[PDB]
Amino acid sequence: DVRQFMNTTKAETLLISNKSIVHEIMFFDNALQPKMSSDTLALSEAVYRTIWNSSIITQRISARGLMNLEDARPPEAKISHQSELDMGKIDETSGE
Amino acid sequence: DVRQFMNTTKAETLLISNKSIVHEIMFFDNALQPKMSSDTLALSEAVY
């Protein structure tokens, strides 16, 4: 949400805390970057980042990106896992 | 000048003339078309 992505905490504060308070951090994804028009001059200065999640933080991502950057499947788009679209019978006694 | 390119004469008039009058015609070039962003859906109908 490049329009509405904040920068909540600078790292100078993740080293000052009572070790028992959970911060909240806003990660920004851009893996589905369109390849801009073949007119713009390539950039000259990049963007930095400091924090890095040490483990997996994506269990609640059903789908990432509905685009078509080349009018086909974007080579890193993620459709949902077949596990979450199962409709099996129920034991007629206790739902479940 | 896609912004300011007219369409002066339709061909139905280049066949009606006294053979001695010079028309003026505006040709439009676009050979240096940028290849637009790899996001837009390819077009469906061309230009004649």
Side-chain angles (χ1 to χ4, degrees), chain A residues 1-11 13-95, chain B residues 1-11 13-48:
Chain A
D1 297 68
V2 198
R3 313 154 44 218
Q4 41 171 5
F5 156 75
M6 285 318 108
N7 199 18
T8 171
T9 74
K10 64 179 180 180
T13 201
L14 256 58
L15 279 146
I16 303 301
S17 69
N18 74 330
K19 96 192 172 51
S20 157
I21 171 172
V22 54
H23 317 78
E24 70 284 37
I25 304 181
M26 186 177 289
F27 290 110
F28 165 68
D29 191 308
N30 75 323
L32 295 177
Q33 181 77 252
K35 183 178 179 180
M36 291 164 51
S37 89
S38 57
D39 167 76
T40 172
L41 324 169
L43 324 177
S44 84
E45 72 303 336
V47 287
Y48 305 117
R49 74 177 258 157
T50 44
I51 63 172
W52 295 92
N53 54 338
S54 180
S55 65
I56 48 177
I57 64 179
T58 175
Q59 297 95 15
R60 313 187 298 281
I61 293 315
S62 59
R64 165 170 78 163
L66 275 299
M67 278 295 104
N68 42 358
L69 83 166
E70 277 277 325
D71 298 330
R73 156 187 293 280
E76 183 178 2
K78 300 288 181 171
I79 39 175
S80 71
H81 287 289
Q82 74 167 354
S83 315
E84 76 94 21
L85 283 192
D86 189 334
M87 185 175 291
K89 52 218 158 284
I90 56 171
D91 63 82
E92 280 58 29
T93 56
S94 45
Chain B
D1 297 68
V2 198
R3 313 154 44 218
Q4 41 171 5
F5 156 75
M6 285 318 108
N7 199 18
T8 171
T9 74
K10 64 179 180 180
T13 201
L14 256 58
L15 279 146
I16 303 301
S17 69
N18 74 330
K19 96 192 172 51
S20 157
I21 171 172
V22 54
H23 317 78
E24 70 284 37
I25 304 181
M26 186 177 289
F27 290 110
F28 165 68
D29 191 308
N30 75 323
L32 295 177
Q33 181 77 252
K35 183 178 179 180
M36 291 164 51
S37 89
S38 57
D39 167 76
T40 172
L41 324 169
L43 324 177
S44 84
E45 72 303 336
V47 287
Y48 305 117

